[PDB]
Short mmCIF file of C-alpha atoms and ligand atoms in Angstrom, two decimals:
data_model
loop_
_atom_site.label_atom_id
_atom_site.label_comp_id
_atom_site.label_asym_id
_atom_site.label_seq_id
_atom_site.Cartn_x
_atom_site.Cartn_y
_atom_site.Cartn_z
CA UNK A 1 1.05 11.42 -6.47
CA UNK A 2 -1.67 8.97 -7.98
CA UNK A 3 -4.62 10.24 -9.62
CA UNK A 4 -7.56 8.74 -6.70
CA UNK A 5 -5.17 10.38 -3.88
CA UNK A 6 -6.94 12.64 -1.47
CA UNK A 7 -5.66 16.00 -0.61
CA UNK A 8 -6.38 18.30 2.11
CA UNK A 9 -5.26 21.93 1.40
CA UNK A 10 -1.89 21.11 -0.16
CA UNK A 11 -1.08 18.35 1.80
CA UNK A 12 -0.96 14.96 0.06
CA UNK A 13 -2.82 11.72 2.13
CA UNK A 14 -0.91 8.67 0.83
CA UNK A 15 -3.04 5.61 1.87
CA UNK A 16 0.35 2.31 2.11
CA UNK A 17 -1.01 -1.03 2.64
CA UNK A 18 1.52 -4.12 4.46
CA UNK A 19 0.52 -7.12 4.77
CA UNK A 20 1.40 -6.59 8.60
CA UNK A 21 3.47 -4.73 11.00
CA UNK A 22 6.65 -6.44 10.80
CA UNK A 23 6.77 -5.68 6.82
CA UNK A 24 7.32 -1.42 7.92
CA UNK A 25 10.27 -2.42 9.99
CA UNK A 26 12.16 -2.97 6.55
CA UNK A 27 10.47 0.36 4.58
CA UNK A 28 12.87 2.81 4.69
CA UNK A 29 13.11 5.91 4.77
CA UNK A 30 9.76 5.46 7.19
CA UNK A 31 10.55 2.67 9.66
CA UNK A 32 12.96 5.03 11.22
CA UNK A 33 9.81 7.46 12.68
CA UNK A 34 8.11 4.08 14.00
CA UNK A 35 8.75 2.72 17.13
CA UNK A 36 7.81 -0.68 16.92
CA UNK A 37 7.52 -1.99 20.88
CA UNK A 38 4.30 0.32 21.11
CA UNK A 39 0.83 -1.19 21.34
CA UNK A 40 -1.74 0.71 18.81
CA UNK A 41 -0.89 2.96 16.30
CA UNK A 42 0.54 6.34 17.18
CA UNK A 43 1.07 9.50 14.85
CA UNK A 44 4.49 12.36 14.96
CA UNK A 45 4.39 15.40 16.87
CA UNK A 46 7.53 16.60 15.37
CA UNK A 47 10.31 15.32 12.69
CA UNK A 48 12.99 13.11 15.16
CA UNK A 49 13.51 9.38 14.77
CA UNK A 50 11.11 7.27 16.68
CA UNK A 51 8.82 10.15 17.16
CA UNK A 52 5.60 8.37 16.10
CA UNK A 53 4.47 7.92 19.59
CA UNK A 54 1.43 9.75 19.92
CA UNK A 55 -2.04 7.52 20.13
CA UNK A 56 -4.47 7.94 17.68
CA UNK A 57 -8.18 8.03 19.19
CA UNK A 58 -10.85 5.34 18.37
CA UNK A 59 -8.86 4.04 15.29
CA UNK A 60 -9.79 1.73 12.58
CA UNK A 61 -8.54 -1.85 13.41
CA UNK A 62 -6.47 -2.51 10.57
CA UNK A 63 -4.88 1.25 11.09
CA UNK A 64 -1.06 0.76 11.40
CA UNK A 65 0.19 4.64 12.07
CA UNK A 66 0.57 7.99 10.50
CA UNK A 67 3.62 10.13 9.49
CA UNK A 68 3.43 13.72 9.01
CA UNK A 69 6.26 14.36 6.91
CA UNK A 70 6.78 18.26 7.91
CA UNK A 71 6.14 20.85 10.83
CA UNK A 72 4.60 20.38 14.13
CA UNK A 73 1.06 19.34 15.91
CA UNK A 74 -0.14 19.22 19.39
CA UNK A 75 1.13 16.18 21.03
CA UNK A 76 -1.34 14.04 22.83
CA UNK A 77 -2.54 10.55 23.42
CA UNK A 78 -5.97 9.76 23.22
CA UNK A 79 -7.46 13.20 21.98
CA UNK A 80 -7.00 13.32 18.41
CA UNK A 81 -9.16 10.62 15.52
CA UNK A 82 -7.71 9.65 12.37
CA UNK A 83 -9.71 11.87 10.17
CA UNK A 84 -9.47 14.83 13.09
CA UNK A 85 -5.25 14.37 12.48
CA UNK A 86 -5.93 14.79 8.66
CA UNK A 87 -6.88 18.63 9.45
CA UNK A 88 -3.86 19.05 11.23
CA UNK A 89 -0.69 18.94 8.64
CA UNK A 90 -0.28 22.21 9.86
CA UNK A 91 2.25 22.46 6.66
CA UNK A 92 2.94 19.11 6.00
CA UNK A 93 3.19 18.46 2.11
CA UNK A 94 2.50 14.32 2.49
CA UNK A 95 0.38 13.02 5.54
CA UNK A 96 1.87 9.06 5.15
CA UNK A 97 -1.27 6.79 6.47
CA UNK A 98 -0.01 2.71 6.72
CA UNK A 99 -2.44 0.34 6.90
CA UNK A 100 -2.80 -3.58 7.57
CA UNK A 101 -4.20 -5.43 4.96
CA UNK A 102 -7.39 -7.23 5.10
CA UNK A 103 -10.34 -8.88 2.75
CA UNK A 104 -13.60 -8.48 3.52
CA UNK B 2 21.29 4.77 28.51
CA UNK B 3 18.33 6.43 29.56
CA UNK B 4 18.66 9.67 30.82
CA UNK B 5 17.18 13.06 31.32
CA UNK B 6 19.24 16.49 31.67
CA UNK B 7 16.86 18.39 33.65
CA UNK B 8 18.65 19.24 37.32
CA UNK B 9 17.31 17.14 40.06
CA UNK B 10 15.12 14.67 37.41
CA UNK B 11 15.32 11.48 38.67
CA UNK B 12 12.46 10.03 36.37
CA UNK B 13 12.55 6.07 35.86
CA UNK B 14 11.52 6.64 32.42
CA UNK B 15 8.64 4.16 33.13
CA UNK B 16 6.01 6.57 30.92
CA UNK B 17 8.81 7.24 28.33
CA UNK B 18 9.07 6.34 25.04
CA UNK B 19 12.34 5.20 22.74
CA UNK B 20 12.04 9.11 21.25
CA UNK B 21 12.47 10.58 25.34
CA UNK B 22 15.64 8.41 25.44
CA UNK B 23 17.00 9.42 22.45
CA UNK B 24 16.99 13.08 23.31
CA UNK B 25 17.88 12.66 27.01
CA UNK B 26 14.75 14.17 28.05
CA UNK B 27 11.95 12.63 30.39
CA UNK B 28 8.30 13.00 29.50
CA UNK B 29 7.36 15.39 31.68
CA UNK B 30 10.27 17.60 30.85
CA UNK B 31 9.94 17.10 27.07
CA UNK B 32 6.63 20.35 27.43
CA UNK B 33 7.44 21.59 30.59
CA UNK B 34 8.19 25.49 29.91
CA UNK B 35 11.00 26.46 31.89
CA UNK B 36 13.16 23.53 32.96
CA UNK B 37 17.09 23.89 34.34
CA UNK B 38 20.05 22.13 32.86
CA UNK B 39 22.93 22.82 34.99
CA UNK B 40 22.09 25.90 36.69
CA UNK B 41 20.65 27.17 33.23
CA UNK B 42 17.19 27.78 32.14
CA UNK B 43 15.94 26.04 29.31
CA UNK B 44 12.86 24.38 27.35
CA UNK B 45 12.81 21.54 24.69
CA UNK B 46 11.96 22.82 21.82
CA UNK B 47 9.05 20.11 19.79
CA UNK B 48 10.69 21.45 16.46
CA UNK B 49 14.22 20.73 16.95
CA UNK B 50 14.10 17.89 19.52
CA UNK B 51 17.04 19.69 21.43
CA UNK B 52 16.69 21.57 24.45
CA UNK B 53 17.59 26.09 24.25
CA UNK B 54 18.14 28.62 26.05
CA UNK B 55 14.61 30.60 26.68
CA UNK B 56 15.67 33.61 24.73
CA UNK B 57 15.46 31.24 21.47
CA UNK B 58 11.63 31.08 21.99
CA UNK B 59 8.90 33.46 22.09
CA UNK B 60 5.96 33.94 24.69
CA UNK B 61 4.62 30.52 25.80
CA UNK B 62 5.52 28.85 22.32
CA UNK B 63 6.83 25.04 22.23
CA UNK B 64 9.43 25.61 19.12
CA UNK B 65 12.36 28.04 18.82
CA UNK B 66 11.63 31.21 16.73
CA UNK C 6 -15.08 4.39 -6.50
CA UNK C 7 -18.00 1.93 -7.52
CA UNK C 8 -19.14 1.21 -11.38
CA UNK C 9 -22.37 -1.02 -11.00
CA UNK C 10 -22.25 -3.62 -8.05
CA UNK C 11 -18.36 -3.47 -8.73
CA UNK C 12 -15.99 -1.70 -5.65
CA UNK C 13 -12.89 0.25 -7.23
CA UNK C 14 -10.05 -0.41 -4.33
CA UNK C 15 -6.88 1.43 -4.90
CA UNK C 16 -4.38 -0.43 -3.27
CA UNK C 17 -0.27 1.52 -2.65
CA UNK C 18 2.55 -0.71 -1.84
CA UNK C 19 6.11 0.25 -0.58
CA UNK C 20 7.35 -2.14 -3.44
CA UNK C 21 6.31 -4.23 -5.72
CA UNK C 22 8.71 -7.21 -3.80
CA UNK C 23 5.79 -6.40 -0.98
CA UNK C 24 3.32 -7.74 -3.32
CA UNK C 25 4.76 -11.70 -3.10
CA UNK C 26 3.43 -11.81 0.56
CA UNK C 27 -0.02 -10.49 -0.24
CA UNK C 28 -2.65 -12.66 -0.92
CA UNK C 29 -4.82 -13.78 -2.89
CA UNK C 30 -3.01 -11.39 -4.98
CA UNK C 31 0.77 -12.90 -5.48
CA UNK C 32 -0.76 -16.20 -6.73
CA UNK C 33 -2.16 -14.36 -9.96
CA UNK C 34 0.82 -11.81 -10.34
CA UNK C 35 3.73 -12.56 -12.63
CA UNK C 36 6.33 -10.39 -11.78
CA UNK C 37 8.43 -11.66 -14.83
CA UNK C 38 6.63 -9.23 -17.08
CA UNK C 39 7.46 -5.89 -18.07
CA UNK C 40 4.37 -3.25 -17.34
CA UNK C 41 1.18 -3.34 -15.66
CA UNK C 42 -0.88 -6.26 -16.69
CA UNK C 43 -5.02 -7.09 -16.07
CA UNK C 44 -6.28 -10.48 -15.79
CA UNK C 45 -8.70 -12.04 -18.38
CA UNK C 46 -9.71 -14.97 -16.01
CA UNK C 47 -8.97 -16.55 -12.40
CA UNK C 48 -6.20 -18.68 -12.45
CA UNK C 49 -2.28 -18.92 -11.44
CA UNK C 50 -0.30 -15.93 -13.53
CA UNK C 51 -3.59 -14.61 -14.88
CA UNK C 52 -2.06 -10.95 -14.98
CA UNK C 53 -0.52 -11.04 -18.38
CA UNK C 54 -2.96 -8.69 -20.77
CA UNK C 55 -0.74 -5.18 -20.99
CA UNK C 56 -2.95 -2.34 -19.92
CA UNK C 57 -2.60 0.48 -22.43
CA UNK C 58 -0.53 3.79 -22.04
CA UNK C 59 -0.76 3.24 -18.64
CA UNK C 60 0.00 6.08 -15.75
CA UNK C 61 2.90 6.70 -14.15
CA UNK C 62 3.69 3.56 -11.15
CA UNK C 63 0.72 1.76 -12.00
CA UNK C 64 1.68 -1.92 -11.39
CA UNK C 65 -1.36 -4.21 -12.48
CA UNK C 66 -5.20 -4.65 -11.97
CA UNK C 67 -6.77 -7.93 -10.81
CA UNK C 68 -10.81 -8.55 -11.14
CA UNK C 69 -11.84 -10.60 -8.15
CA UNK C 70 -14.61 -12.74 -10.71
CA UNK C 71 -15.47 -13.93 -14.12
CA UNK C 72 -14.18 -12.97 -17.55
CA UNK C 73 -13.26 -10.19 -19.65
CA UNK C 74 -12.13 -9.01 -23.31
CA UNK C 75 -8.29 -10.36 -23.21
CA UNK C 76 -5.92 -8.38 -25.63
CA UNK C 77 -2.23 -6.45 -25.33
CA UNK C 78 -2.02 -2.34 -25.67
CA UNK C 79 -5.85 -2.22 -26.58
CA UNK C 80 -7.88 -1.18 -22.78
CA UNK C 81 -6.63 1.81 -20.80
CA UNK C 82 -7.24 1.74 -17.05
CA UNK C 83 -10.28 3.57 -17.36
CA UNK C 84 -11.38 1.44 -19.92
CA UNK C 85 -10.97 -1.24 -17.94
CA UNK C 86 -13.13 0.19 -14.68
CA UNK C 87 -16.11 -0.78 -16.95
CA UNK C 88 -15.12 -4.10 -18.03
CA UNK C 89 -15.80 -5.76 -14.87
CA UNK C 90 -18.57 -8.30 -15.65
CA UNK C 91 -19.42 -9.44 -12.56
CA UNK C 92 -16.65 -9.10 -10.69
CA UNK C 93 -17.43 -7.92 -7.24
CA UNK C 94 -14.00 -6.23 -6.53
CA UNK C 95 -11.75 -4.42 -9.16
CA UNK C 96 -8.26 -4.23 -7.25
CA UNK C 97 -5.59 -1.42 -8.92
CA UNK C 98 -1.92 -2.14 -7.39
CA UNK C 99 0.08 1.22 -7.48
CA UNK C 100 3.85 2.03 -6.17
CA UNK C 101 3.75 4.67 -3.83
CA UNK C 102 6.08 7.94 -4.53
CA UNK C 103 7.21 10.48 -2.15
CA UNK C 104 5.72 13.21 -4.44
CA UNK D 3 6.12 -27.25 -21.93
CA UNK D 4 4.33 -27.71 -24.83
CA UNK D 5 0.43 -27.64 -26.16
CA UNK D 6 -2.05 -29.95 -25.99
CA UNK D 7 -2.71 -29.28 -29.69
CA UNK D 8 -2.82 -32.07 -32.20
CA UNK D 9 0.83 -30.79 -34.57
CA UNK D 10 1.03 -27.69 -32.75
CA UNK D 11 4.24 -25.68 -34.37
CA UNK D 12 4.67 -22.93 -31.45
CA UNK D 13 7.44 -22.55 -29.33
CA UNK D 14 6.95 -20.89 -26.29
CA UNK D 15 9.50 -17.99 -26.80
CA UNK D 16 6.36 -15.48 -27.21
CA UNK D 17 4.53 -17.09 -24.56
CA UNK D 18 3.64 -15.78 -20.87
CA UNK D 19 4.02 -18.67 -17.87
CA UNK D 20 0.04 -18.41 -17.82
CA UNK D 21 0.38 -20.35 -21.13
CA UNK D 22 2.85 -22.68 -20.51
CA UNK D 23 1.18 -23.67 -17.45
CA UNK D 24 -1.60 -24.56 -18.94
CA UNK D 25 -0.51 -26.35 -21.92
CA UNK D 26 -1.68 -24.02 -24.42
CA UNK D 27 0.08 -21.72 -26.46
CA UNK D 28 -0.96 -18.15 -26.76
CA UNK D 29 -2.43 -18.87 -30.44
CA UNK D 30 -4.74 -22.00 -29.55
CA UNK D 31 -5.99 -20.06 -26.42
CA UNK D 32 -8.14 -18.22 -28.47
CA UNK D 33 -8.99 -20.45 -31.13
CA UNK D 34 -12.84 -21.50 -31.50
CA UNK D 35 -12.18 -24.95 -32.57
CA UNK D 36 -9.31 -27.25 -32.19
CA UNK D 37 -7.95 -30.70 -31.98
CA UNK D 38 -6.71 -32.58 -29.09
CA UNK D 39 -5.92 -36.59 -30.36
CA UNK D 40 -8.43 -36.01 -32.90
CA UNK D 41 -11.48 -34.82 -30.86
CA UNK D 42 -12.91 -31.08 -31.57
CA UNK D 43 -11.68 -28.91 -28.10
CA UNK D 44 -12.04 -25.77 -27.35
CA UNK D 45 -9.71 -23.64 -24.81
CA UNK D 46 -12.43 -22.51 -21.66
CA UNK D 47 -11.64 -18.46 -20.70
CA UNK D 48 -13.23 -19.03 -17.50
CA UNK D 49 -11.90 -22.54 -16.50
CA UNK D 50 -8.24 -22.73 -18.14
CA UNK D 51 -8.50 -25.75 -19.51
CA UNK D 52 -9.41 -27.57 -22.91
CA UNK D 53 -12.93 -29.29 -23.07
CA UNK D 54 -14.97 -30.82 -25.66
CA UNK D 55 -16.59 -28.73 -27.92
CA UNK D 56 -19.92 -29.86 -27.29
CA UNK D 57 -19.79 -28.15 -23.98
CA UNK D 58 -19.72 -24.57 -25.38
CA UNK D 59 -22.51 -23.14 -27.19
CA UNK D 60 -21.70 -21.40 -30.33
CA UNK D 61 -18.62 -18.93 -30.47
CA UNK D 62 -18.54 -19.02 -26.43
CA UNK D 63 -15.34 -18.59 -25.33
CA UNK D 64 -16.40 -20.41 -21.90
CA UNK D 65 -17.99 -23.79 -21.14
CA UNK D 66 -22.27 -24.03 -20.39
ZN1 ZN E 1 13.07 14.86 33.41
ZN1 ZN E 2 14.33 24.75 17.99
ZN1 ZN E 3 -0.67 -24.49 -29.66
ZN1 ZN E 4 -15.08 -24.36 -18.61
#
């Protein structure tokens, strides 16, 4: 990992900016987790293609999804905030954040 | 094709996702505890993604042992 | 994170092919060159100054404003965090890795 | 192309696009005073382009 990335415990947070949603259906080996005809952005459960289905609470507008990249995590829509999933690699060693792009 | 195993689910898959069709299991059926496929009792294990037999998993867990 | 009025922003692409589509960014890029490069200046292929012994899948840094020291293999990237002069925005473009 | 430079003897092997573009080699870029059809110019850092010297002040490498 880069020097500024955040860890929590031993799990990596790796911050991946697209210019917009249609750029992550050709980033493999992650576009495979996403499933692309949901509205808002979701986070795994579980390891499984399309498994990012789950839908983060009260997220930041330009937030785009999150892949755990090991184990498993309760599996709920609407009960768990970004920073709330960031607790809960539950032995993940990456937690993969993508994010929309935007100046300001 | 759409589908889940469970005996006697005749979901629409209208509250499913691409991941439920995949692994031929409905949403509700995906964390309900004791389910039947085909006479035999089961539960879909979160871990694997594939259903087992109940003697895989220990008391009131979602993933096999 | 901030040196003066200046924001540090830390920016990881999938590629550095993903950079093309970004802008203002790809107008000032020159993905020609070999090793991460600063800009000096604002204007089209600005990033050409070659950022000293530079870290592993760093791929450039572009100040948002004004003018800066411009020389090859003599400013690390820390070095560089303090050369902002103005600038409101220092933006540092790295490759992601699996780990 | 080529530089602006009154008898300028660069080629632009060892130059980056930046240069090229902007009619300037990498050497005259820098250079606190040089000629452009005979008039006194000076390469501006901040605008990237040549102007007449009397619009810098003293070793400036941008314009007033
Ligand atoms: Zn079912
Ligand atoms: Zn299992
Ligand atoms: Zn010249
Ligand atoms: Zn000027």
């Amino acid at each position: 990992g880069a020097p500024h990335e955040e860890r929590v415990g031993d799990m990596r947070i790796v911050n991946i900016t697209f210019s917009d949603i249609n750029s992550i259906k050709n980033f493999q080996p992650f576009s495979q987790y996403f499933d692309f005809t949901l509205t808002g952005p979701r986070y795994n459960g579980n390891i499984a293609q399309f498994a990012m289905i789950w839908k983060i609470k009260n997220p930041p507008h330009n937030l785009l999804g999150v892949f755990f990249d090991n184990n498993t995590r309760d599996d709920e829509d609407d009960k768990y905030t970004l920073e709330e999933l960031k607790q809960m690699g539950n032995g993940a060693k990456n937690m993969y954040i993508f994010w929309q792009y935007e100046q300001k | 094709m759409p589908i889940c195993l469970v005996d006697g689910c005749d979901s629409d898959f209208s509250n499913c996702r691409e991941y439920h069709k995949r692994h031929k299991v409905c949403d509700v059926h995906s964390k309900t505890p004791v389910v039947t496929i085909n006479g035999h009792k089961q539960r879909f294990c979160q871990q694997c993604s594939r259903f087992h037999a109940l003697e895989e998993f220990d008391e009131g867990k979602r993933s096999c042992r």
